[PDB]
Motif scaffolding. Structure first.
Motif, short mmCIF file in Angstrom:
data_model
loop_
_atom_site.label_atom_id
_atom_site.label_comp_id
_atom_site.label_asym_id
_atom_site.label_seq_id
_atom_site.Cartn_x
_atom_site.Cartn_y
_atom_site.Cartn_z
N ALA A 9 0.86 -1.23 -0.08
CA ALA A 9 -0.04 -0.15 -0.05
C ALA A 9 0.96 1.28 0.03
O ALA A 9 0.66 1.93 -1.06
CB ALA A 9 -1.11 0.02 1.14
N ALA A 32 3.85 1.88 -0.73
CA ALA A 32 5.20 1.68 -1.38
C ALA A 32 5.49 3.05 -2.07
O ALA A 32 4.57 3.88 -2.55
CB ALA A 32 4.76 0.74 -2.57
N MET A 53 11.56 3.54 3.73
CA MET A 53 11.34 2.13 4.10
C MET A 53 10.84 2.20 5.57
O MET A 53 10.04 1.54 6.02
CB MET A 53 12.66 1.49 4.13
CG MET A 53 13.08 1.15 2.74
SD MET A 53 14.74 0.74 2.48
CE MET A 53 15.11 0.83 0.76
N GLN A 106 7.19 3.05 5.80
CA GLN A 106 6.52 2.00 5.31
C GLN A 106 6.03 0.92 6.46
O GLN A 106 5.05 0.33 6.55
CB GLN A 106 7.00 1.60 4.00
CG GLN A 106 6.33 0.41 3.48
CD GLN A 106 6.85 -0.04 2.05
OE1 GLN A 106 7.87 0.47 1.65
NE2 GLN A 106 6.08 -1.12 1.44
N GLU A 107 7.46 0.55 7.06
CA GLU A 107 7.27 -0.17 8.26
C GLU A 107 6.47 0.07 9.30
O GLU A 107 5.61 -0.43 10.04
CB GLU A 107 8.47 -0.59 8.68
CG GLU A 107 9.38 -1.44 7.96
CD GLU A 107 10.76 -1.96 8.56
OE1 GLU A 107 11.12 -1.40 9.43
OE2 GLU A 107 11.75 -2.29 7.57
#
Ligand SMILES: CCCCC/C=C/C/C=C/C/C=C\C/C=C\CCCC(=O)O[C@H](COC(=O)CCCCCCCCCCCCCCCCC)COP(=O)(O)O[C@@H]1[C@H](O)[C@H](O)[C@@H](O)[C@H](O)[C@H]1O
Ligand SMILES: COC1=C(OC)C(=O)C(C/C=C(\C)CC/C=C(\C)CC/C=C(\C)CC/C=C(/C)CC/C=C(\C)CC/C=C(\C)CC/C=C(\C)CC/C=C(/C)CCC=C(C)C)=C(C)C1=O
Ligand SMILES: CCCCCCCCCCCCCCCCCC(=O)OC[C@H](COP(=O)(O)OCCN)OC(=O)CCCCCCCCCCCCCCCCC
Ligand SMILES: NC(=O)C1=CN([C@@H]2O[C@H](COP(=O)(O)OP(=O)(O)OC[C@H]3O[C@@H](n4cnc5c(N)ncnc54)[C@H](OP(=O)(O)O)[C@@H]3O)[C@@H](O)[C@H]2O)C=CC1
Ligand SMILES: CCCCCCCCCCCC(=O)OC[C@H](COP(=O)(O)OCC[N+](C)(C)C)OC(=O)CCCCCCCCCCC
Ligand code: SF4
Lengths: 116, 231, 89, 68, 123, 175, 317, 57, 329, 77, 56, 77
Positions: free
Chosen positions: E6, E8, E80, E83-84
Motif C-alpha cells: 500500500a 510503497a 522504508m 512504510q514499516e
C-alpha cells in the motif's frame, strides 16, 4: 409430574453445576497480554440465508399434507403436485440465474497476443 | 474503492514460522504479501568464518527434511573448485542416499499437504515409512535427522555391514505401501475438486518467476538437472 | 384475548416511539403479528373450529415471507450507504 | 499382532499376578525369557513369539513405580 | 509480486538537490500525519507530541549533509522506515527502540567528569 | 498476642510425609488433580525449525504420543504447555512471548533442541536469541541438536514427574 | 555501551571486609560482585527489586516458599546470577543458611491477613526476629528492613502495631539496619488497587518501580546505615478522589460480618484489620529522610464526514 | 486434442452411476477399512527403545 | 413419583456416560485406522480418559476477552448444551419406552434441532472481531442449509406413516425397514447428518477454555448420537431386529419380570447396535477425507442435492398414488 | 469565518521560536514574519489542518507560506 | 522490469549488502529484524553484531 | 587448518526434490570461503506466491502452500 419435565428442568441443573465447578475451582489470574471498521462481503452470503426461508416455509407447508394424505386421496394429491411444481419453477429460476455462486474475480486473462 | 480487509496467516497450515499478510475482498485474495525472516539466523555470514569442513553442517540445517541433497550441493561445489574426482562407489552411494532423501522429502511434503487440506491418515502412513528410512540414516551416519555424511571429498565413511540387504527388503514392500496412499487421494473426488484449477502457472511465467523442479515440470516444460546436466 | 391485545399494543407503541435503531422496528412488527396470532388462535379454540387455525397457519407463512422480503430490502438500503443511521431511514 | 488371542494366551502364560503388574506398568501383555537382571535391579526379557513386530522383541520390567 | 504494498514507492534517485528537498518535506508531512495512528497502533504510554518531537529530532540529525547521493540513500532508508511503521509490521518492542531515553531512568551515578568516569573506568 | 507459637522444627515440602487424616485427604485430592494434568497433556509448539519434524516423529506411528495422552491443540488458549522446538531469532522473541502470554495459568514449557537453549549452532549470530531462557521461564531442557524422539519423550516423562510433586493442594496447607 | 549506574565506582569494599572488583561493562553478562538475599522476592515489590538487582549482575539469593511462582524470576538475571533455595520461616537453619554468603540482605516478609499458621505477630515481629538473629549471627553488612507506613505501636491496628514491634525488634538486634517505610504502592496489576477497582482518609501512593529504585539506591551507599526512611509520593490524595480519577480514566458492623463469612476460602480474602487501617491515614515522621536524600523524584499518580466518505467505498462487492 | 463428450466409450448411465453412487470414494473408504484390521507400529518408549547403530551420537 | 425420577436418572446416567465414552472410542478407532494405538495411559485399557480430560478442564482458567459480552459468551454454551440434550426424550428404547410419550414426537425432534443453530451464530457475537464474525456466518449458513434437507428427508419418511408419533413409525417398520426401499435416502441422510454437526468431512470454519469448552464438547457428541438416533428410528429399524416369537415360545411360559427384562434387553440391544455402527461410520468417514471450501459446500447442497430431493418429492407420493396405497392415521 | 481566523491564529501561537505571539498579522509569512524553519513550514501547516479534520494534497500544502494563504485556502470544505 | 521473479532476489541483495536497484517497487528489508540498523553481509559488520535482546 | 581451495568462483546447482537448489561460493584461496550463498528453491517459490494466489478463495490459498512445499529453512536462512 411426568418423566418429561424433570428432564426439561434437570439438563440446566447439569450445566449450572458444571460451570459452577470450574468457576468455583479454577484460577482466574488474568492480565493485558493474556487478554485480547467493518468488512465487505459477497452477495451469495446474505443470499443463502435470505432465500433459505422461502424453502423452509414450503417444507413446513408439506407438513399439513403428509398427515392428511389418506383423507384427500386422488384430489389433495394433485393440489400438492401443482403446489410443488409451482415452487420447482422458482427453484429452476434460482439455479438458472447462478444466484448462490461466489465467483472468482481474476481469470487467466484469455485475450490473445496481437501485434502492431 | 474496493476496500480490502487485512489479516495474516501468522506463525501460530502455515507450517510454522511463516507470516502471510493477505488482503481480502470477501472471499477473494486481491493482494498477498509473505513476510519472511522469523527463521533467519545469518548462516550465510557464519559460513564465511568457518572452514569448509566446519561449514558442512550449515547446509543440512537449512531445508531440514532433505539433508543429503543439501550436503551434496555444497560438496559438489567444493569438488568443482578443488578439481578432484570422487571414486566410483562414492558416486553410486550418494546417488542412492540422494534418492532415499528424495523419497523422504516427497513423503513428508505430500502427506503434509494432505494434512493441511484435510486428509490425515496419509500423514501417519508416510511417517512410518519415514521411520523406516531414518533408521537407514542412523545406521549410515550417527544421527537420524542431521547427517554430515556427504562431504566435499566424497562420503564420510563406508556402509555398515548388512545394509544393502536391508534397503532391498524395504523396497519390496514400499512399492505397495505407496499404491495404498495413492488410492484414497488420486481418484478421491474431494481431493480432486480441491486441487484441479488451483495454482495454475503458465509455462512462460514459470520461467520468469524462476520456478523449477516440480513447479516447472507441472507446467509442461521437460527440464530436470539429473537428466539435462547430469552428475 | 388479553395477552394478544397487550403484546400487540405494547409492540405497536414500541414501534411508534422507536428512535434508536431500525431493527427494533422489524422486531416490533413481528411481535405485532405474534399478538394477532394469539388472539385468533384463542378464538379458534373457544369456537371449536379450524378456520381461525386456517387463517393463523396462513399468516405464519405470510409473516415469514414479509421478513425475508423486507430484510433483503434493508440489505439493498445498506448497499449504497455502508451505515444505517440511529435516527432512522 | 493386535489380536485378542495374543493378549489372551500371553495373560495365561505369564499368570494373573504378573498380568496385573504388567497392566499397571505397560498396556501390552508380554511373555519373556529372563535374559538377566540389572545392578540397579531391572529384569529384562526377550520374546521369541511368532506374531511380533520388529522392535518389540526385547523389553524391561523396572523395579520402582517411578521408572526412567 | 506485480502488485506492490500500500504505502510503497518505486525507489527513484534524484539528480537535483531541490527535488529531493521536495521529497524530504513530503516525507516529513507523511510522518507527522501518521503520528496519532502510531500512538494508537503501538499502545504507547505517553502522548502524540513526543512522537512528533522524535520525528523532528530524527530529521535534525541529518540536516547539514551535503552530498546528494548520501541524501538519496538517507531518503530511501527513511521511506522504508515510514512504510514499516505505518503498515503495523514493526512491533511495539521495536517501535520503542526509538525511545531509549524515555522509558526509565537507568539509575544513579551518571559519569560526567573525568574522575567519575575514572572511578568506574568508563564501565 | 505477644507469644510466638511457630515451631523451631517443621519439615520442608520436599521432606514432609503425611500424618493426619486431613493430610491423607489433601494428598488423595492432589493425586487425582495431578493425574488429570498428566493423563491429558496438551503441547502448544512454538518450534520454528528442524526440531519440528522430530516432534512430528512423536506423532508418528512408531513413537506414538496419543498413547501417552498427548495431542496438539494448536491454539495457546487451550494448550497446557509450550514447546520451543527450534531457534529463536530476534524478530520472533516478542511473538514467542505473546504466544506464551495467552495460555491459561497452569502452564509449563519445555525447551526442545540445542538451538532453543543457549543459541546453539547459531550462538554467535546477529539475529538470534541465545535460548528462550531470556524470553520464557522454561522448566525442562531437552538437549540434542535433533534431540532424538526417544529423548523428547523422555523430557515429557521428566515433565510429568515434575507434575507428580507440584502439590497444588498441600501447598495451600502451608507445608 | 552499557554502564554500571547502580555503582558509584568499580572497586567497592564492604564493611565486613570483602573486596569487590566489578567486571566488564554494565549489563547482563557482567558481574558487580555483591551477593544479595531478597526475602519475599515472589512478592510485588520483590519482583521489581531483584529485577533491578540482577540486571547488572549482582548475585541474588532468593529463598522461596512455593516453586511454581518463582520461575518468573529466572528470566531476570544471567546464567548463574539468581539462586533459588527453599525456605520455611519455621526451620531456622534455612534462614541462617540463606543469609550465610550475602553481603547485603533485604526482608519483605509481611502478610495482609492472619491465617491458620501465622498471625500478624509471627510474620511481622518474629520472622523479622529470626532474620535479624541470622544477620546478627553472620556479620552481614547492610541489613535492610522494609515496613509499612503508619508503623507505630500505640496504634489500635494490629498490622501497624506489630510492624512497629518489628522495627523495635530489628533495632533491638542489629544497630546498623536501614529501615524503610513506603507509602501505599501503585503498580501493574497490584493486589488491592487499580485492578481491584478498575473515603475520607488521605494517603500518598508511590509507584513501585521508584520504591524499588529508591531501595536499591539505599542498598549500595553506606551513608544509609542506621537511618529510617519514609518514601511518599508528591501530592496528598483522598480515596474518592483517587477512584474518580480512575472513573474517568476508564453499616460497618455487617460489612465486617460479610468479610467474616468470606474468609474461609482459599482465595485472598480481605482482612478485618484492613477496614481498621482505612480510617487511619498517612502521618509521616518529619525526622526521616525521603526521596531527595537519594537523588530521585517519584512519579505522580495522575459522524458527519465519515458517512460521505463511506458513500464512495464498496460494501457488498 | 481432448476428447469431447460424444467420443467416449462410457455410457451416460454408466458414467453417472459412478457419479451418484460415489464409486471411488467407497474404494478409498475400503482402503482404510482394511487398515483397521492390521498390526500397529507403536513401541512403548521407556519399556522398549527403538533402533541403535554404534555410530549414533 | 419415586418411579419416574428413578427412571429419568437411569436414562440420564446412561446417555451422559455414553456421550463421554464416544470420545474415547473415536480416539481409539482413529488411531487404529492410522495404525497406532489409542490411549492406554489412563485406564486399565485406556478408559475414563474422557473423565481425565473433563477433570482437568474443569480446572482450567477461563478467559473473558476485552472484546466480549461476558454473559452471552458463557450462556451460549448452556443453550447449546441444553438443546443438544433436550432432544434425548423422544427416542424410544423399545415400544413406548421414552421419557415422554407425546403424539407429535417428530415435530418436537425437528423443532429442537432448529434451536441448535443459535449457539454457533450467537457465539460469533462473542469476542467481536471482524474475522470472529464472518466465520460464524459461514458456520450458520452451512448449518441452516443442511437442516433444510434434514427436514425434507423427515417429511419424505412421514409420507409412509402419516403420524408424527415415533414409536408408531417403528411399529410401522416391522414389515420392512425404510432404508431397504429408500437406500439413496440413507446416503443423502447420512451426509446431511455429517453436515449438520459440521463434522470434519464437511468442516470449514475450524479450518475459550474450561466450561465454555466442555459444554460445546458435550453438545458436539450429544448431537452426534442424537442425529444417529434420528437415523436409527426413521430410516433403519428403531429397536427391531427379527421376529423372536418362536424363541420366546421355546423359552418362556408366561409373562414375568424376567421376560420383560429379556425383551427390553433385545430391543435396546438392536437399537444400540444400529447407533454404534452409525457412530463408527461417522468416525470412519472422518478418517478418510479432506475438507470443503464454502463454495463446494453451498454448490453441493443447493445445486446438487436439493433438485434431486424435489424429484423425490414428486416421485414418492406418485408411487403411493399409482398403487392405491395411502397411509391411514 | 472570523473566529476561524482566531482559531488559525489560536494554534499558531501554540509553538516556539516565537518571541512575540502578538506579531501574527493576517498576512504573516512563516519564514520572514515569524522566523520559521524549512521544517516548521510543514509542521505548523499539519497542525493547522488536524485542528479541523480536513486533509491536504501536497501542492495544496507546499504552496502555503503565509496565514493569509491558509485562511484563503480553508474554505475547501 | 523484465523478470518478475527477480525483485525478491534484489531485495535480499538490498538487505545483506545495501546495494540499490533503481526503479524497484518495494525495495525494503527482508530476512532481518525490522528496526535493524546495519547491513550484515559486509566486512565491517562484526559477526555477533551490535545489539542483543532480553526481556526486561 | 583445513584444506585450501584454489581461488575461484562457482555456481553449482543440483535438483533437490523441492526444485533446483544451488550454491554460489567464492573461494579466496584461503581455507575459509570468502563468500557463500544458498539459492533455495522455496525462496523463488514463495516469491511467486502473489503472482498465482490472486483471485483464489481463502481455502485454496492453503492448498497452494502445500505444492510449493515451504520448509522455511529454505526461504530464510
Ligand atoms: C462435582 C465434583 C466432581 C469433580 C471431580 C473432579 C475432581 C477434580 C480434582 C480437583 C482438585 C482441586 C484443585 C483445584 C485448585 O486448583 O484450587 C486452587 C486452590 O488450591 C487448592 O488446591 C484448593 C483445593 C479445593 C478442593 C475442594 C475444597 C472443598 C470444596 C470447596 C468448594 C485454586 O486456587 P485459586 O485461588 O486460583 O481459586 C479461586 C477460585 O477457583 C475462583 O472461584 C475465584 O473466582 C478465583 O479468583 C480463584 O481465586
Ligand atoms: C490431532 O488431531 C486431532 C485428534 O486426533 C486425531 C482428535 O481426536 C480431535 C478431537 C479432540 C478431542 C476428542 C479432545 C476432547 C477434549 C476433551 C476435553 C474430552 C472431554 C471429555 C468429556 C467432556 C466427557 C464429559 C462427561 C461427563 C461430564 C459425564 C456426565 C455424567 C481433534 C480436534 C484433533 O485435532
Ligand atoms: C444413476 C444412479 C441413480 C440415478 C438416480 C439419481 C440419484 C439417485 C441416487 C441418489 C444418491 C445421491 C448421493 C449423493 C450424491 C453425490 C453426488 C456427487 O458426487 O456430488 C458431486 C459434487 C460436485 O459435483 P461436480 O463439481 O460436478 O464434480 C463431481 C466429480 N465428477 O461433489 C461434492 O460437492 C462433494 C461430494 C461429497 C460426497 C460425500 C462425501 C462425504 C460423505 C461420504 C459418505 C459415505 C457413506 C459411507 C458410510 C458407510 C456405512 C457402512
Ligand atoms: N498496599 C500494598 O501493597 C502495601 C504493601 N506493603 C508491605 O510490603 C511488603 C510486600 O508488599 P506486596 O509486595 O505489595 O504484597 P505481597 O503479596 O508480596 O506480600 C506477601 C509476600 O511475602 C510472602 N509471604 C507472606 N507471608 C509469608 C509467610 N508466612 N512465609 C513466607 N512468605 C510469606 C509472600 O509469599 P507468596 O508470594 O508465595 O504469596 C509474598 O511474597 C509487605 O510487608 C507489605 O506489608 C507496604 C504498604 C502497603
Ligand atoms: C463403565 C466401565 C468403565 C471402566 C473404566 C475402568 C478404567 C480403570 O479402571 O482405570 C483405573 C484407574 C486409573 O489407573 P492408572 O494407574 O492411571 O492406569 C495406568 C495404566 N497403564 C499403566 C497401562 C498406563 O485407577 C483408579 O483407581 C480409578 C478409580 C475410579 C474408577 C471410576 C470408574 C468410572 C467408570
Ligand atoms: S536445534 Fe538443531 S535441528 Fe533443531 S532447529 Fe536448531 S539446529 Fe535445527
Amino acid at each position: 409430574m411426568n418423566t418429561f419435565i424433570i428432564f426439561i428442568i434437570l439438563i440446566p441443573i447439569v450445566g449450572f453445576a458444571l460451570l459452577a465447578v470450574n468457576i468455583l475451582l479454577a484460577v482466574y489470574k488474568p492480565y493485558n497480554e493474556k487478554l485480547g471498521t467493518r468488512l465487505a462481503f459477497n452477495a451469495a452470503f446474505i443470499l443463502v440465508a435470505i432465500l433459505f426461508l422461502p424453502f423452509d416455509l414450503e417444507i413446513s407447508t408439506l407438513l399439513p399434507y403428509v398427515m392428511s394424505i389418506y383423507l384427500v386421496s386422488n384430489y389433495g394429491f394433485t393440489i400438492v403436485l401443482l403446489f410443488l411444481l409451482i415452487l420447482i419453477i422458482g427453484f429452476v429460476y434460482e439455479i438458472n440465474t447462478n444466484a448462490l455462486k461466489i465467483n472468482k474475480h481474476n481469470k487467466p486473462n484469455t485475450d490473445s497476443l496481437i501485434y502492431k | 474503492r474496493i476496500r480490502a480487509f487485512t489479516i495474516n496467516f501468522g506463525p501460530q497450515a502455515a507450517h510454522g514460522v511463516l507470516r502471510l499478510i493477505l488482503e481480502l475482498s470477501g472471499e477473494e485474495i486481491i493482494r498477498s504479501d509473505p513476510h519472511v525472516g522469523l527463521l533467519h539466523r545469518g548462516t550465510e555470514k557464519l559460513i564465511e568464518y568457518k572452514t569448509y569442513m566446519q561449514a558442512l553442517p550449515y547446509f543440512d540445517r537449512l531445508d531440514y527434511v532433505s539433508m543429503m541433497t543439501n550436503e551434496q550441493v555444497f560438496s559438489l561445489a567444493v569438488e568443482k573448485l578443488l578439481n578432484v574426482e570422487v571414486p566410483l562407489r562414492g558416486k553410486y552411494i550418494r546417488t542412492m542416499f540422494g534418492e532415499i532423501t528424495r523419497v523422504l522429502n516427497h513423503l513428508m511434503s505430500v502427506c503434509s499437504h494432505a494434512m493441511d487440506v484435510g486428509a490425515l491418515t496419509p500423514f501417519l502412513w508416510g511417517f512410518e515409512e519415514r521411520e523406516k528410512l531414518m533408521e537407514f540414516y542412523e545406521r549410515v551416519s550417527g544421527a537420524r535427522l542431521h547427517a554430515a555424511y556427504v562431504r566435499p571429498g566424497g562420503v564420510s565413511q563406508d556402509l555398515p555391514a548388512g545394509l544393502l540387504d536391508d534397503i532391498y527388503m524395504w523396497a519390496t514392500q514400499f512399492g505397495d505401501r505407496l499404491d495404498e496412499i495413492e488410492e484414497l487421494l488420486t481418484d478421491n473426488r474431494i481431493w480432486k475438486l480441491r486441487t484441479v484449477n488451483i495454482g495454475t502457472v503458465t509455462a512462460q511465467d514459470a520461467l520468469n518467476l524462476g520456478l523449477s523442479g516440480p513447479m516447472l515440470r507441472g507446467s509442461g516444460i521437460p527440464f530436470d538437472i539429473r537428466k539435462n546436466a547430469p552428475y | 384475548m388479553f395477552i394478544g391485545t397487550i403484546i400487540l399494543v405494547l409492540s405497536f407503541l414500541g414501534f411508534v416511539f422507536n428512535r434508536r435503531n431500525i431493527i427494533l422496528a422489524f422486531i416490533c412488527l413481528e411481535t405485532m403479528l405474534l399478538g394477532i396470532n394469539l388472539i385468533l388462535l384463542r378464538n379458534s379454540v373457544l369456537f371449536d373450529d379450524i378456520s381461525g387455525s386456517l387463517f393463523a397457519i396462513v399468516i405464519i407463512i405470510l409473516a415469514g415471507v414479509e421478513s425475508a422480503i423486507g430484510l433483503s430490502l434493508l440489505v439493498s438500503y445498506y448497499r449504497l450507504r455502508g451505515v444505517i443511521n440511529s435516527y432512522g431511514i | 499382532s493386535s489380536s485378542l488371542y495374543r493378549v489372551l494366551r500371553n495373560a495365561w502364560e505369564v499368570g494373573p499376578r504378573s498380568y496385573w503388574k504388567q497392566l499397571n506398568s505397560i498396556g501390552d501383555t508380554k511373555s519373556g525369557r529372563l535374559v538377566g537382571t540389572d545392578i540397579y535391579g531391572n529384569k529384562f526379557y526377550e520374546t521369541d513369539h511368532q506374531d511380533e513386530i520388529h522392535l518389540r522383541t526385547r523389553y524391561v520390567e523396572y523395579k520402582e513405580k517411578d521408572y526412567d | 509480486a506485480i502488485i506492490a504494498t500500500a504505502f510503497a514507492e518505486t525507489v527513484k534517485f534524484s539528480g537535483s538537490k531541490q527535488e529531493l528537498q521536495k521529497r524530504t518535506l513530503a516525507l516529513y508531512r507523511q510522518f507527522l500525519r501518521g503520528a496519532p495512528t502510531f500512538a494508537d497502533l503501538y499502545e504507547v504510554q505517553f502522548s502524540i507530541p513526543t512522537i512528533r518531537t522524535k520525528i523532528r529530532q530524527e530529521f535534525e540529525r541529518h540536516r547539514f549533509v551535503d552530498d546528494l547521493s548520501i541524501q538519496n540513500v538517507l531518503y530511501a532508508k527513511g521511506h522504508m522506515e515510514y512504510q514499516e511503521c505505518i503498515n503495523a509490521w514493526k512491533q511495539q518492542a521495536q517501535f520503542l527502540k526509538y525511545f531509549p531515553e524515555e522509558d526509565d531512568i537507568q539509575g544513579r551515578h551518571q559519569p560526567s567528569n573525568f574522575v567519575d568516569k575514572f572511578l568506574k573506568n568508563r564501565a | 498476642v505477644s507469644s510466638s507459637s511457630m515451631p523451631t522444627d517443621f519439615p520442608l515440602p520436599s521432606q514432609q510425609k503425611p500424618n493426619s487424616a486431613v493430610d491423607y485427604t489433601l494428598t488423595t485430592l492432589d493425586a487425582v488433580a495431578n493425574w488429570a494434568r498428566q493423563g491429558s497433556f496438551w503441547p502448544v509448539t512454538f518450534g520454528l525449525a528442524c526440531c519440528a519434524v522430530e516432534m512430528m516423529h512423536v506423532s508418528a506411528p512408531r513413537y506414538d504420543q496419543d498413547r501417552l495422552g498427548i495431542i496438539f491443540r494448536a491454539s495457546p488458549r487451550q494448550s497446557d504447555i509450550m514447546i520451543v522446538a527450534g531457534t529463536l531469532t530476534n524478530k520472533m522473541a516478542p511473538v514467542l512471548r505473546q504466544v506464551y502470554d495467552q495460555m491459561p495459568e497452569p502452564r509449563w514449557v519445555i525447551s526442545m533442541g540445542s538451538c532453543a537453549n543457549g543459541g546453539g549452532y547459531y550462538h554467535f549470530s546477529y539475529s538470534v536469541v541465545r535460548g528462550c531462557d531470556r524470553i520464557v521461564p522454561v522448566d525442562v531442557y531437552v538437549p540434542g541438536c535433533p534431540p532424538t524422539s526417544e529423548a523428547l519423550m523422555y523430557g515429557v516423562f521428566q515433565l510429568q514427574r515434575k507434575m507428580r510433586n507440584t502439590k497444588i493442594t498441600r501447598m495451600w496447607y502451608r507445608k | 555501551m552499557n554502564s554500571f549506574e547502580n555503582l558509584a565506582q568499580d572497586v567497592n569494599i564492604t564493611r565486613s571486609g570483602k573486596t569487590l572488583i566489578a567486571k566488564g561493562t554494565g549489563g547482563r553478562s557482567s558481574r558487580t560482585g555483591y551477593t544479595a538475599t531478597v526475602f519475599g522476592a515472589n512478592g510485588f515489590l520483590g519482583s521489581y527489586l531483584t529485577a533491578k538487582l540482577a540486571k547488572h549482575g549482582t548475585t541474588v539469593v532468593v529463598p522461596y516458599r512455593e516453586e511454581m511462582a518463582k520461575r518468573h524470576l529466572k528470566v531476570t538475571g544471567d546464567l548463574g546470577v539468581v539462586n533459588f533455595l527453599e525456605m520455611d520461616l519455621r526451620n531456622l537453619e534455612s534462614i541462617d543458611e540463606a543469609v550465610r554468603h550475602s553481603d547485603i540482605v533485604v526482608n519483605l516478609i509481611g502478610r495482609e491477613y492472619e491465617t491458620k499458621n501465622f498471625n500478624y505477630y509471627d510474620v511481622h515481629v518474629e520472622g523479622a526476629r529470626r532474620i535479624a538473629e541470622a544477620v546478627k549471627k553472620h556479620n552481614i553488612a547492610r541489613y535492610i528492613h522494609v515496613s509499612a507506613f503508619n508503623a507505630e505501636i500505640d496504634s489500635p491496628s494490629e498490622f501497624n502495631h506489630t510492624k512497629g514491634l518489628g522495627e523495635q525488634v530489628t533495632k533491638d538486634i542489629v544497630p546498623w539496619a536501614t529501615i524503610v517505610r513506603p507509602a501505599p504502592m501503585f503498580g501493574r496489576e497490584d493486589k488491592w488497587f487499580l485492578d481491584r477497582m478498575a473515603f475520607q482518609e488521605t494517603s500518598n501512593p508511590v509507584h513501585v518501580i521508584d520504591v524499588a529504585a529508591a531501595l536499591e539506591r539505599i542498598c549500595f551507599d553506606d551513608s544509609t546505615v542506621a537511618q529510617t526512611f519514609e518514601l511518599y509520593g508528591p501530592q496528598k490524595f483522598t480515596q474518592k478522589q483517587i477512584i474518580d480519577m480512575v472513573s474517568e480514566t476508564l453499616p460497618k458492623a455487617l460489612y465486617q460480618a460479610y468479610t467474616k463469612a468470606t474468609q474461609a476460602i482459599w482465595w485472598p480474602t480481605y482482612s478485618p484489620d484492613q477496614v481498621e487501617r482505612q480510617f487511619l491515614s498517612q502521618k509521616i515522621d518529619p525526622s526521616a529522610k525521603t526521596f531527595n536524600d537519594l537523588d530521585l523524584t517519584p512519579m505522580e499518580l495522575p459522524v458527519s464526514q465519515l458517512e460521505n466518505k463511506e458513500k464512495t467505498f464498496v460494501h457488498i462487492l | 486434442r481432448p476428447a469431447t463428450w460424444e467420443e467416449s466409450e462410457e455410457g451416460a448411465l454408466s458414467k453417472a452411476t459412478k457419479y451418484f453412487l460415489l464409486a471411488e470414494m467407497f474404494r478409498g473408504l475400503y482402503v482404510v477399512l482394511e487398515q483397521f484390521f492390521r498390526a500397529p507400529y507403536t513401541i512403548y518408549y521407556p519399556f522398549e527403545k527403538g533402533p541403535v547403530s554404534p555410530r549414533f551420537r | 413419583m419415586i418411579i419416574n425420577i428413578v427412571e429419568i436418572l437411569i436414562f440420564l446416567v446412561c446417555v451422559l456416560f455414553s456421550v463421554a465414552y464416544l470420545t474415547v472410542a473415536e480416539r481409539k478407532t482413529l488411531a487404529y485406522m492410522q495404525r497406532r494405538l489409542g490411549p492406554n495411559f489412563v485406564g486399565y485399557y485406556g478408559l475414563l480418559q474422557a473423565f481425565a480430560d473433563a477433570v482437568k478442564l474443569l480446572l482450567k482458567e477461563i478467559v473473558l476477552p476485552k472484546e466480549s459480552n461476558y454473559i452471552i459468551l458463557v450462556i451460549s454454551p448452556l443453550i447449546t448444551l441444553i438443546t443438544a440434550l433436550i432432544g434425548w426424550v423422544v427416542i424410544p428404547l423399545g415400544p413406548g419406552i421414552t421419557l415422554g410419550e407425546l403424539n407429535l414426537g417428530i415435530l418436537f425432534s425437528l423443532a429442537i434441532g432448529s434451536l441448535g443453530v443459535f449457539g454457533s451464530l450467537l457465539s460469533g457475537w462473542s469476542s467481536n472481531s471482524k474475522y470472529s464474525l464472518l466465520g460464524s456466518i459461514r458456520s450458520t449458513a452451512q448449518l441452516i442449509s443442511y437442516e433444510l434437507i434434514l427436514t425434507s428427508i423427515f417429511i419424505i419418511i412421514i409420507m409412509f406413516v402419516s403420524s408424527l408419533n415415533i414409536t408408531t413409525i417403528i411399529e410401522t417398520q416391522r414389515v420392512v425397514w425404510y432404508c431397504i426401499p429408500l437406500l439413496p435416502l440413507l446416503l443423502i441422510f447420512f451426509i446431511a447428518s455429517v453436515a449438520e454437526t459440521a463434522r470434519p468431512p464437511f468442516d470449514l470454519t475450524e479450518s475459550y477454555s474450561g466450561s465454555p469448552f466442555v459444554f460445546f464438547f458435550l453438545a458436539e457428541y450429544s448431537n452426534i448420537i442424537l442425529i444417529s438416533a434420528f437415523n436409527g428410528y426413521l430410516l433403519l429399524g428403531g429397536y427391531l431386529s427379527f421376529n423372536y416369537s418362536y424363541l420366546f415360545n421355546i423359552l418362556f411360559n408366561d409373562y414375568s419380570y424376567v421376560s420383560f427384562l429379556f425383551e427390553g434387553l433385545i430391543n435396546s440391544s438392536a437399537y444400540a447396535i444400529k447407533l454404534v455402527f452409525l457412530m463408527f461410520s461417522f468416525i470412519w468417514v472422518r478418517a478418510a477425507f479432506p475438507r470443503f471450501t464454502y463454495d463446494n459446500l453451498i454448490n453441493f447442497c443447493w445445486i446438487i442435492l436439493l433438485p434431486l430431493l424435489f424429484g423425490i418429492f414428486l416421485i414418492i407420493p406418485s408411487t403411493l398414488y399409482i398403487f392405491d396405497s395411502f397411509p391411514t392415521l | 469565518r472570523p473566529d476561524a481566523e482566531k482559531r488559525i491564529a489560536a494554534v499558531l501561537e501554540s509553538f516556539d521560536k516565537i518571541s512575540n505571539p502578538a506579531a501574527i498579522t493576517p498576512t504573516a509569512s512563516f519564514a520572514k514574519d515569524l522566523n520559521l524553519d524549512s521544517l516548521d513550514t510543514v509542521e505548523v501547516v499539519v497542525a493547522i489542518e488536524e485542528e479541523f479534520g480536513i486533509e491536504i494534497p501536497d501542492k495544496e500544502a507546499d504552496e502555503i507560506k503565509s496565514v493569509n494563504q491558509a485562511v484563503e485556502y480553508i474554505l475547501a470544505q | 522490469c523484465l523478470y518478475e521473479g527477480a525483485n525478491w532476489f534484489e531485495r535480499e541483495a538490498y538487505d545483506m549488502y545495501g546495494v540499490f536497484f533503481e526503479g524497484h517497487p518495494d525495495l525494503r528489508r527482508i530476512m532481518t529484524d525490522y528496526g535493524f540498523e546495519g547491513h550484515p553481509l559486509r566486512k565491517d559488520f562484526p559477526l555477533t553484531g551490535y545489539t542483543e535482546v532480553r526481556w526486561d | 587448518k583445513g584444506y585450501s581451495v584454489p581461488p575461484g568462483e562457482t555456481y553449482t546447482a543440483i535438483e533437490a526434490p523441492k526444485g533446483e537448489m544451488g550454491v554460489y561460493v567464492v573461494s579466496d584461496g584461503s581455507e575459509r570461503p570468502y563468500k557463500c550463498k544458498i539459492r533455495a528453491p522455496g525462496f523463488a517459490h514463495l516469491g511467486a506466491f502473489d503472482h498465482i494466489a490472486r483471485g483464489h478463495f481463502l481455502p485454496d490459498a492453503v492448498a497452494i502452500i502445500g505444492t510449493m512445499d515451504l520448509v522455511f529453512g529454505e526461504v530464510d536462512r
